[PDB]
C-alpha cells in the first residue's frame, strides 16, 4: 500500500490501485509521484 507524504528507502515495495511498484531510489513520496512518472526509481510491474 504505497503511502503519500512519506519516507521510503531504496529496495522499497509500494503499491498504487491494484498497481505494482519498488522503490529503487530513498526518498519521500509526495502528493504528485503516484503515476511513478519518475522510472529514474520506480520499478513497477
Known sequence: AWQVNTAYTAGQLVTYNGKTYKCLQP????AGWEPSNVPALWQLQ
Do not use: R
Not at 526518498?27 to 509526495?30: D, E, G
Open 27 to 30: 526518498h519521500t513520496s509526495l
